[PDB]
Design a protein around this ligand. Structure first.
Ligand SMILES: *[C@@H]1O[C@H](CO)[C@@H](O)[C@H](O)[C@H]1NC(C)=O
Ligand SMILES: *[C@@H]1O[C@H](CO)[C@@H](O)[C@H](O)[C@H]1NC(C)=O
Ligand SMILES: *[C@@H]1O[C@H](CO)[C@@H](O)[C@H](O)[C@H]1NC(C)=O
Lengths: 27, 49
């Protein structure tokens, strides 16, 4: 899906996906 | 020509925003620390309670 969240998050210096949330959604 | 009646259309009521869990959950917490709530979108509220 398309998947979404607003979560206050500590992202990396090079964030990726492999080969504390007040809202979330899917499509 | 006068309007013979009123008509209203709003979309299928869909995101009942969930009161269900906040009044069904087996594990209601003790006084000190409990649970909490947040809002997403659409119309839920109703009047079941
Ligand atoms: C992909 O999106 C779906 C949306 O339902 C989610 O269940 C799943 O955890 C997601 N996976 C990744 C790797 O983002
Ligand atoms: C989670 O969000 C709340 C928002 O008030 C904040 O108090 C808390 O410190 C946050 N914690 C983390 C680990 O993001
Ligand atoms: C709890 O669940 C029952 C059905 O199992 C339902 O009739 C009742 O209204 C629920 N309570 C609330 C308001 O969550």
């Amino acid at each position: 899906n398309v998947v979404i969240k607003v979560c206050e998050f500590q992202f990396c210096n090079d964030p990726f996906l492999g080969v504390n949330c007040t809202f979330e959604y899917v499509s | 020509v006068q309007p013979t009646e009123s008509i209203v259309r709003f979309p299928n009521i869909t995101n009942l925003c969930p009161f269900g869990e906040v009044f069904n959950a087996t594990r209601f917490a003790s006084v000190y620390a409990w649970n909490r709530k947040r809002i997403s979108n659409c119309v839920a509220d109703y009047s079941v309670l």
